[PDB]
């Protein structure tokens, strides 16, 4: 069933190769948007995502 608690069983999710320096429609873990991807020098803490 599916009406007792929050979903803890999920189906597999596929992945696609990432591209750089090109205008694409990216989708990172449910984050959506449009733009170009390039390398950075930011110093994200280990527990931070975006």
């Amino acid at each position: 069933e599916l009406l007792h608690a929050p979903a803890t069983v999920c189906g597999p999710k596929k992945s696609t190769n990432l591209v750089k320096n090109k205008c694409v429609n990216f989708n990172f873990n449910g984050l959506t948007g449009t733009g170009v991807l390039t390398e950075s020098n930011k110093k994200f803490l280990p527990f931070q995502q975006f």
């Binding site: 608690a5 929050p6 803890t8 803490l45 527990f47």
Partner: peptide, 29 residues
């Protein structure tokens, strides 16, 4: 305990149980 320090997250458990009271297991806290 004088000063400032931020606390980083550790875990996130999807237990979903109602909690109203708690107790510790054992010299001061």
């Amino acid at each position: 305990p004088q000063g400032f320090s931020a606390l980083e997250p550790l875990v996130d458990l999807p237990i979903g149980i109602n909690i109203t009271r708690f107790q510790t297991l054992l010299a001061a806290y």
